[PDB]
Write a protein that binds this ligand. Structure first.
Ligand SMILES: Cc1cc2c(cc1C)N(C[C@H](O)[C@H](O)[C@H](O)COP(=O)(O)OP(=O)(O)OC[C@H]1O[C@@H](n3cnc4c(N)ncnc43)[C@H](O)[C@@H]1O)c1[nH]c(=O)[nH]c(=O)c1N2
Ligand code: PRO
Ligand code: PRO
Ligand code: PRO
Ligand code: PRO
Ligand code: PRO
Ligand code: PRO
Lengths: 973, 60
């Protein structure tokens, strides 16, 4: 038995290309046969009458969003009982008006079949929505034609139903016949326990349907089924490995046994790169069961676009050797390329787990295919591709043998593989059809549309007559030529995302067991109050250090911040441990705050050089110079919260310091130890002792600091009430009117309409409301959801919220740590008890013994029932009618807050109408509302949410400074 | 003198009056006021509030 798979996550592309490039060399007569095969295949592709997705996209010059909208509308129209009824609709209503209504209803239909029944259309309606913009661009008649073509595609290439039973009934062959295709089951990412059971039953149900229609031939000439591990477990993630191995393995085994009893091909699909190791763990434990001996149909997909692909092949082979099994192994290039790039950047990884040049994937795919062909007969390879060149090359390397197959998706590669079958009679290819229910269509269509709409896609190019046939025949090695060119030149490494402005902080990929274990190990390996006199002395000492710090050159202040960033990341294990023990933060939140703290230092340093590093020359008359500068104001008092006790503490403090002010810093009572370490670190990084003082204690000590007549400003993050009293104590003084910078939370809403993917809304609602136990100023408090999808969305949020593990934040599996202290928990439980008597309850999770509040979900009759920011894991939901979006926006305006706002919608015109109407500081569209990144999402809002300027943005530092104009009459010279 | 004082408008070897818009941004600190300087590049922003719009474009 091989040890648990653990290859390097993102090794260097050049070293890989240095081996693959010389080894790709094929002999001249080999390459000529490849050229001819692929030419004949492409000529058949260009024969041209069954259309495809890519054909529809190209014909009407549709974006992927527009393709999606029409295919969803098409699916809804196909399920209207009377075809003549759908035709009347297409002619008389579609494109005439009600554009957003048609897009909303047809999408709601996928989760709520009763949502749509076929109002009346007034003429002259402004064409908005995805459909309306399509009508303005192409004209209503072309939209009707494109919709009719989408209906043919949806009916011919998908096997769908309102439930899996209906899909399987529709995809059933005539009694006594074998199915002419294998089942690529729709379904991914269970969000709820019921989801995981439902997909399990769909798979078991599908295995019986194809089992009964399987023929009398032996493998490989029998139908197959494809399943996703993420569909079978609601927290399929590396940090939940322990429950995954206990719960998922028996499930996958049960389905594998049912597959074996019909002698089927049973294939585990390959998903995102951070699930690779977990999937192999689950697959290894499942294959190990002796009940699966004597059956040759078990297998998995392997993604060639991963640098680890070749090692996965070795691992799978040693598995088959160790258990004396035969496996069927599918080689694909990979369906998640864009996701892997984005994820690596967001996560600050030291590289990409995938190649970044298409030819490198194509090169690695052929190398992996050659490796798999040599592992026959123990490995039966399945080459799933619609690339005529890839097919031609793989066929040549097999040298005319058997013991393998090609694979395609229904609606793609048909002309390719028919021609291959004509020219080489012994070639087998497996055709999969997508099979599933409407509630799984949207998520699937999104991914399918990305590959078909891609410019680099082979099937898209081989069908565009503008692309000459010889262009599609360039061999991958000839496009790369040299190893140093393996990486794509226009995609920086995550560490270079902000170059040359500044460096980026490093993150950790939790789906790489070596990385997660090293971090867990490092972290495991790791104050009297101030009298009013000592706080008074602190101001006086900061006041005395101001002059020298103010006149220290900006580049030296900036160097100190950059060295502070260096020390934070070098000592990340220490601060993470402090964030877990003192802050109560889970490991993902602690790492993220540590990164944010370093990001604040480097960002304010770079801004600091631009702003205070040199003077701005003003135009003016000759004989006279005019120069504008900015300089420190004096002593800033910085008051910081307990919920970001390191990053907001350091953002506020280093901003004031960078602008040339000395600082007296008063941390939250609950988290002084992290603040002491941070202050000590800034001193060590070069902040003079006289420029920065820490004063710990109560709100009376915070009041004494902000009431002190010698301070030049206050930077404060906390509650509205305390900011007002600070503001009043400042206004009460007879001295100068000094700046107050305040961020004071929000009652943050999210608006989700029926065009949004309900499983993405659910993910983002669960994250935004319950991550960090809701102890974030940015957290989602109030979800507005359109009534046609409200039931499904609320139930999915509740089921997902139920799978959150609440407990000790040091345990790797914890999703929800404790709230900060007993007093906070008491405030939250009081609001929970009040909401139970006042509003509908949807979920009240079980809290472990101790200082914990569990996720809660309440539904309100009106938004007005929620009158306070409640700083915990407590979501409130209002369902609304689409014609009442104005009442939603008025409710959001009525709270007086304006920090974050989430918008989930496919419809650009709706998104824009919301953005135009609200004043909220941070609007997040089709993603969660939390974790603003320094210099990426400048963070902060208005109204009762605070004053600005936004932290982590280009207007922040100036507010800590005052301007100076120097005008010199130079005429004497 | 310039290094020592915090005064908003320093006029060297000329009179101290008649600031020109966009040439001598006018305004100071302490009991002379809050800023930002009138007729300079930091004035208009203070009358405004910032907005960040973050769109997950990956669906496209
Ligand atoms: C029967 C069957 C079953 C499956 C799959 C396909 C089929 C036919 N796939 C999908 C597969 O991985 C792939 O996305 C499509 O088949 C298209 O790839 P081709 O070889 O057809 O075409 P094509 O040759 O046009 O290749 C496209 C691929 O190149 C890669 N690519 C594009 N740009 C790149 C760049 N700049 N740098 C590096 N690489 C780049 C991407 O992987 C992209 O998908 C899959 N996928 C998966 O991840 N898990 C799975 O289990 C399956 N299962
Ligand atoms: O996609 C993932 O890996 C995690 C698992 C549950 C939610 N997101
Ligand atoms: O905004 C804050 O940081 C505190 C925490 C609970 C209430 N206000
Ligand atoms: O964006 C977030 O979630 C936190 C809250 C204050 C700023 N950063
Ligand atoms: O406090 C402010 O807003 C001014 C504007 C420019 C410099 N500081
Ligand atoms: O510069 C001056 O003389 C006047 C005083 C206020 C602004 N303009
Ligand atoms: O009051 C201020 O200074 C903020 C900063 C940019 C817009 N207004």
């Amino acid at each position: 038995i091989p040890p648990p798979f653990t290859a390097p996550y993102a090794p260097d592309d050049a070293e890989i290309a240095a081996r693959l490039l010389p080894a790709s060399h094929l002999s001249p007569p080999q390459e000529a046969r490849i050229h001819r095969t692929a030419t004949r295949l492409i000529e058949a592709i260009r024969k041209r009458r069954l259309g495809g997705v890519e054909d529809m996209l190209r014909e009407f010059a549709l974006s992927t969003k527009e393709g999606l909208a029409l295919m969803v509308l098409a699916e809804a129209l196909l399920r209207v009982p009377d075809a003549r009824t759908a035709d009347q609709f297409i002619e008389d209503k579609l494109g005439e008006g009600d554009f957003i209504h048609h897009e909303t209803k047809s999408t709601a239909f996928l989760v709520n079949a009763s949502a749509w029944a076929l109002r009346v259309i007034q003429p002259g309606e402004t064409p908005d929505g995805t459909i309306g913009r399509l009508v303005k661009r192409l004209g209503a008649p072309a939209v009707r034609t494109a919709t009719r073509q989408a209906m043919r595609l949806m009916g011919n290439h998908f096997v769908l139903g309102e439930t899996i039973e209906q899909a399987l009934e529709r995809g059933k062959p005539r009694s006594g016949q074998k199915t002419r295709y294998s089942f690529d089951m729709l379904g991914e990412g269970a969000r709820t326990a019921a989801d995981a059971r439902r997909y399990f039953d769909a798979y078991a149900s599908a295995i019986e349907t194809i089992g009964k229609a399987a023929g009398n031939h032996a493998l490989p000439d029998r139908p197959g089924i494809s399943v996703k591990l993420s569909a079978l477990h609601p927290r399929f993630e590396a940090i939940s490995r322990a429950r995954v191995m206990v719960e998922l393995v028996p499930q996958l085994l049960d389905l594998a046994q049912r597959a074996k009893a019909h002698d089927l091909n049973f294939t585990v699909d390959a998903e995102e790169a951070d699930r690779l190791e977990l999937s192999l763990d689950v697959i290894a434990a499942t294959l190990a069961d002796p009940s699966l001996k004597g059956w040759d149909g078990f297998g998995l997909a392997i993604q060639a676009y991963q640098k680890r692909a070749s090692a996965v092949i070795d691992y799978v082979d040693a598995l088959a050797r160790a258990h004396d099994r035969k496996l069927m192994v599918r080689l694909v290039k990979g369906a998640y390329w864009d996701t892997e790039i984005k994820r690596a950047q967001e996560r600050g990884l030291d590289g990409y787990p995938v190649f970044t040049r298409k030819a490198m994937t194509d090169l690695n795919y052929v190398a992996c295919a050659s490796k798999l062909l040599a592992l026959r007969p123990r490995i039966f390879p399945q080459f799933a591709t619609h690339n005529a060149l890839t097919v031609a090359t793989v066929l040549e390397m097999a040298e005319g043998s058997s013991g393998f197959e090609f694979q395609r998706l229904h609606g793609m590669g048909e002309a390719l593989y028919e021609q291959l079958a004509k020219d080489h009679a012994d070639i087998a290819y497996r055709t999969y059809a997508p099979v599933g229910s409407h509630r799984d269509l949207l998520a699937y269509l999104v991914r399918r549309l990305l590959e078909n709409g891609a410019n680099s896609s082979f099937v898209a190019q081989a069908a565009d007559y503008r692309v000459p046939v010889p262009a599609l025949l360039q061999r991958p090695a000839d496009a790369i030529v040299r190893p140093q060119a393996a990486a794509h030149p226009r995609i920086p490494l995550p560490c270079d995302l902000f170059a040359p402005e500044r460096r980026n902080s490093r993150g950790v990929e939790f789906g790489a067991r070596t990385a997660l274990d090293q971090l867990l190990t490092d972290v495991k390996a790791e104050i009297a109050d101030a009298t009013p006199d000592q706080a008074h002395a602190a101001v006086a000492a900061a006041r005395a250090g101001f002059a020298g710090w103010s006149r220290t050159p900006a580049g030296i202040r900036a160097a100190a911040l950059e060295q502070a960033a260096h020390l934070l990341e070098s000592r990340s294990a220490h601060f993470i441990a402090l964030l877990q023990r003192e802050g109560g933060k889970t490991l993902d939140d602690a790492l993220s705050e540590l990164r944010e703290a370093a990001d604040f230092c480097r960002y304010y340093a770079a801004q600091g050089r631009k702003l205070f590093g040199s003077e701005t020359a003003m135009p003016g008359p000759t004989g006279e110079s005019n120069a504008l500068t900015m300089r420190g104001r004096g002593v800033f008092v910085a008051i910081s919260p307990w919920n970001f006790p390191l990053a907001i503490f350091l953002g506020q403090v280093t901003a004031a310091l960078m602008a040339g002010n000395s600082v007296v810093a008063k941390p939250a009572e609950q988290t002084p130890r992290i603040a002491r370490e941070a202050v000590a670190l800034l001193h060590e990084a070069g902040i003079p002792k006289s420029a920065l003082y820490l004063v710990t204690g109560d709100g009376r000590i915070g009041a004494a600091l902000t009431a002190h007549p010698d301070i030049a400003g206050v930077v404060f993050t906390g509650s509205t009430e305390v900011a007002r009293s600070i503001n009043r104590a400042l206004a009460a003084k007879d001295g100068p009117i000094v700046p107050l910078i305040a961020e004071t939370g929000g009652i943050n809403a999210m608006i989700a309409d029926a065009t949004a993917l309900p499983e993405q809304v659910a993910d983002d609602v669960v994250t935004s409301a319950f991550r960090s136990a809701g102890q974030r100023a940015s957290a989602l408090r109030l979800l507005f959801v359109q009534e046609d999808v409200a039931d499904r969305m609320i139930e999915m949020v509740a089921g997902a919220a139920r799978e959150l593990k609440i407990g000790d934040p040091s345990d790797v599996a914890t999703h929800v740590g404790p709230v900060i202290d007993v007093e906070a928990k008491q405030r939250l439980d009081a609001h929970i008890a009040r909401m139970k008597t006042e509003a509908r309850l949807h979920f009240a999770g079980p809290a472990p013994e101790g200082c914990f509040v569990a996720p809660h979900i309440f539904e309100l009759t009106e938004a007005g029932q929620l009158t306070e920011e409640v700083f915990g894991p407590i979501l409130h939901v209002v369902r609304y009618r689409p014609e009442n979006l104005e009442r939603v926006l008025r409710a959001i305006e009525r709270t007086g807050y304006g920090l974050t706002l989430g918008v989930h919608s496919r419809i650009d015109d709706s998104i824009e109408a919301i953005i135009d109407r609200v004043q909220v500081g941070n609007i997040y569209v089709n993603r969660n509302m939390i974790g603003a990144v320094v210099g990426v999402q400048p963070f902060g809002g208005n109204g009762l949410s605070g004053t600005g300027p936004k932290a982590g943005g280009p207007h922040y530092l100036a507010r800590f400074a005052t301007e100076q104009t120097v005008t010199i009459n130079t005429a004497a010279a």
